[PDB]
Amino acid sequence: SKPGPVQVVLVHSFELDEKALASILLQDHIRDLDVVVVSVAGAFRKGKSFILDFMLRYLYSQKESNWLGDPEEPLTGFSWRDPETTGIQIWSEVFTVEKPGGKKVAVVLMDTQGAKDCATIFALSTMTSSVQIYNLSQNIQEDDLQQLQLFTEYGRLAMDEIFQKPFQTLMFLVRDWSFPYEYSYGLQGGMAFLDKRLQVKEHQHEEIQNVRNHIHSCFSDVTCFLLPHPGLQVATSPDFDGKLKDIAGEFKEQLQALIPYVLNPSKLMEKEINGSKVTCRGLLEYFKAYIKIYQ
Amino acid sequence: MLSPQRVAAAASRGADDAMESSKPGPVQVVLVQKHSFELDEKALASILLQDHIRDLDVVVVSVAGAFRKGKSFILDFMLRYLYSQKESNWLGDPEEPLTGFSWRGGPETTGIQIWSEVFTVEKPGGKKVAVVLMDTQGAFDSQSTVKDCATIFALSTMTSSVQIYNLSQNIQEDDLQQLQLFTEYGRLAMDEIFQKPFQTLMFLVRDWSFPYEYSYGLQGGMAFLDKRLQVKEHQHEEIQNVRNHIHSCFSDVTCFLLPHPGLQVATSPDFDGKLKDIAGEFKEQLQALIPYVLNPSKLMEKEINGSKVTCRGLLEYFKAYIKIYQ
Numbered sequence: 001s002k003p004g005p006v007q008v009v010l011v012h013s014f015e016l017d018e019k020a021l022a023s024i025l026l027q028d029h030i031r032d033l034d035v036v037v038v039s040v041a042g043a044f045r046k047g048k049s050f051i052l053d054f055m056l057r058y059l060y061s062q063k064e065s066n067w068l069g070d071p072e073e074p075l076t077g078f079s080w081r082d083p084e085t086t087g088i089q090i091w092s093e094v095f096t097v098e099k100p101g102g103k104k105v106a107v108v109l110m111d112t113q114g115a116k117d118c119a120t121i122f123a124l125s126t127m128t129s130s131v132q133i134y135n136l137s138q139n140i141q142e143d144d145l146q147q148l149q150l151f152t153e154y155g156r157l158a159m160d161e162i163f164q165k166p167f168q169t170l171m172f173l174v175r176d177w178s179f180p181y182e183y184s185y186g187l188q189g190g191m192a193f194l195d196k197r198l199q200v201k202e203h204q205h206e207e208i209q210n211v212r213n214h215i216h217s218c219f220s221d222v223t224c225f226l227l228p229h230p231g232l233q234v235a236t237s238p239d240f241d242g243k244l245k246d247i248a249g250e251f252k253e254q255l256q257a258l259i260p261y262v263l264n265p266s267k268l269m270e271k272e273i274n275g276s277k278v279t280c281r282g283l284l285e286y287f288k289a290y291i292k293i294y295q
Numbered sequence: 296m297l298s299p300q301r302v303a304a305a306a307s308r309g310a311d312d313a314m315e316s317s318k319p320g321p322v323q324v325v326l327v328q329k330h331s332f333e334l335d336e337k338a339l340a341s342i343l344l345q346d347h348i349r350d351l352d353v354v355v356v357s358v359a360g361a362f363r364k365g366k367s368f369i370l371d372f373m374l375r376y377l378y379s380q381k382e383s384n385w386l387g388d389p390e391e392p393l394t395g396f397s398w399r400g401g402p403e404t405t406g407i408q409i410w411s412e413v414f415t416v417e418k419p420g421g422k423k424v425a426v427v428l429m430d431t432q433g434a435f436d437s438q439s440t441v442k443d444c445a446t447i448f449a450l451s452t453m454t455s456s457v458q459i460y461n462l463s464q465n466i467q468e469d470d471l472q473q474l475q476l477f478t479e480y481g482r483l484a485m486d487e488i489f490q491k492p493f494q495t496l497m498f499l500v501r502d503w504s505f506p507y508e509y510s511y512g513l514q515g516g517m518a519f520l521d522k523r524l525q526v527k528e529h530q531h532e533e534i535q536n537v538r539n540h541i542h543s544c545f546s547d548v549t550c551f552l553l554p555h556p557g558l559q560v561a562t563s564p565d566f567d568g569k570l571k572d573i574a575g576e577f578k579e580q581l582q583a584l585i586p587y588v589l590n591p592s593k594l595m596e597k598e599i600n601g602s603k604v605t606c607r608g609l610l611e612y613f614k615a616y617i618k619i620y621q
């Protein structure tokens with residue numbers, strides 16, 4: 001029937017729903033296209049599906065030729081959201097997007113959720129993503145970094161040899177950033193904040209004293225975006241169904257920076273593994289091969 | 296020789312700057328830096344030994360927690376209530392800036408601050424007591440800056456009628472582990488013969504975002520507290536017995552779930568917008584919270600070793616307790 005999220009890895013053990021994954025990734029019109037994988041990952045109830053909903057609105061507006069909407073319009077769209085399932089979900093619709101110059105690529109949206117058996121699934125989405133958007137609340141804590149270090153090392157260990165770096169882009173997405181008078185919302189404030197915050201954390205906690213070097217050894221690019229609070233109506237509703245105008249002004253403004261920064265055709269980076277670009281079919285094969293290693 | 300009238304005038308401007316420079320504000324009474332703990336006895340005695348309050352039994356309301364969690368904001372509303380009670384809607388009028396004596400106007404300092412003005416309130420039945428407001432602040436982020444935050448947190452717990460443990464959004468394992476530590480460090484100095492070491496503990500949870508799970512306020516906080524504790528015990532063995540530990544140190548444990556105050560408060564370093572610019576539900580819940588702590592029938596005299604303590608006795612405990620941690 002309608003598009004929606006598909007449970008592809010489910011969590012004490014884990015399983016790949018290969019038939020569910022393959023029915024998405026093996027469709028005739030995207031099967032041999034190079035795939036761009038955008039992955040949002042983090043703990044339960046941190047607003048991952050809300051941000052994925054705006055990614056979809058951008059993708060569907062681009063597909064159907066202001067993507068955010070009129071203020072008076074309810075958010076009225078296919079939405080990503082017990083939701084307390086540990087595992088990986090992928091959007092059932094793969095988007096075909098033409099890059100400048102004419103190359104058409106497939107765009108997959110991925111959601112990784114968990115609270116450690118979750119090391120496997122965070123590793124898997126890291127290994128299979130063009131951009132891993134690590135979704136944190138308010139600040140970057142020692143435990144956020146300890147976990148990040150663990151699942152990136154765990155993913156790197158399932159990849160036998162690495163002539164380059166194992167992963168591509170890491171983005172720290174900091175939600176409900178409350179100190180724009182110290183670091184401005186968005187990318188440049190986020191960059192200045194990340195490096196200072198990592199330096200402070202490394203010096204406070206010997207368990208992550210090399211996390212900066214480790215992260216940089218793992219990822220070819222590391223960025224950070226400071227996102228404003230979305231307003232009390234979004235924050236206190238189990239399932240926000242209000243209108244665009246009921247979302248805080250600055251959140252919407254920063255959405256207009258963040259979302260195209262990730263999804264504009266000229267920002268889409270094809271997934272690479274072993275120094276070669278990966279098709280949708282190849283993605284399916286890698287999910288199968290990695291799942292086998294972790295089992 | 297200056298004129299008589301000019302002499303009294305110059306003395307008059309002298310007493311004008313005297314009152315202005317000593318206007319009611321926060322007083323740093325216990326300070327840390329570098330480690331080691333210093334107690335400004337002269338400053339503390341000037342507060343607690345004022346003639347009219349020296350021998351009254353004392354009610355000590357303490358707000359405690361990590362930096363930048365809105366402790367001084369909540370203290371400012373407590374002051375508004377107490378100044379209202381003193382000589383007279385205590386919250387203010389909607390179109391007016393939040394005005395009054397403020398706390399953050401008078402800091403990354405680790406230690407304890409006490410409001411310089413002691414309030415005398417008449418309880419139901421006519422007993423007048425002294426009310427002291429205390430602000431306790433420090434980081435427990437790292438391995439360093441954790442021994443010293445335990446000490447000052449123990450100190451304000453030992454000396455308070457109610458310890459308002461001010462936490463953001465939820466009760467986390469690290470909040471419970473530090474609580475366990477500083478109530479342990481404070482327990483030792485108590486003799487524990489006639490009474491539990493401490494009186495009331497209140498988990499004040501700020502920016503509660505789940506009223507459809509547990510309602511804002513006291514009844515929601517109590518339904519939330521016990522079930523939250525059982526979870527954290529099961530997950531981190533270091534606090535596996537924290538609920539029994541809490542109930543052995545305190546004679547009362549409560550929890551209050553407080554709304555978010557609005558984006559204007561949240562993103563301004565020192566909010567000076569209008570009362571109307573504070574979230575409506577926040578103000579509603581404040582009208583429950585602040586009287587629940589400060590209404591005359593709720594003021595609990597400080598008790599140590601089975602006996603009610605006076606302001607002057609409170610000074611002597613601070614001087615004695617501080618030497619123990621040395």
Ligand SMILES: Nc1nc2c(ncn2[C@@H]2O[C@H](COP(=O)(O)OP(=O)(O)O)[C@@H](O)[C@H]2O)c(=O)[nH]1
Binds near residue numbers: 043047081175240
């Ligand atoms: N404070 C805050 N709440 C949000 C944000 N985004 C979504 N929410 C709310 O937080 C709750 C959890 O959101 P959800 O998207 O389901 O989180 P997920 O479990 O990570 O997918 C819902 O009530 C959302 O309305 C945000 O940026 N900040």
Ligand SMILES: Nc1nc2c(ncn2[C@@H]2O[C@H](COP(=O)(O)OP(=O)(O)O)[C@@H](O)[C@H]2O)c(=O)[nH]1
Binds near residue numbers: 366
């Ligand atoms: N999100 C949120 N912010 C608050 C709250 N109360 C105060 N603030 C803001 O948080 C920041 C720190 O508040 P402050 O009272 O100085 O924190 P303190 O260091 O614990 O005294 C200020 O910008 C306040 O305006 C609250 O309940 N929730």
Ligand SMILES: [Mg+2]
Binds near residue numbers: 048
């Ligand atoms: Mg989700």
Ligand SMILES: [Mg+2]
Binds near residue numbers: 367432
């Ligand atoms: Mg303070």
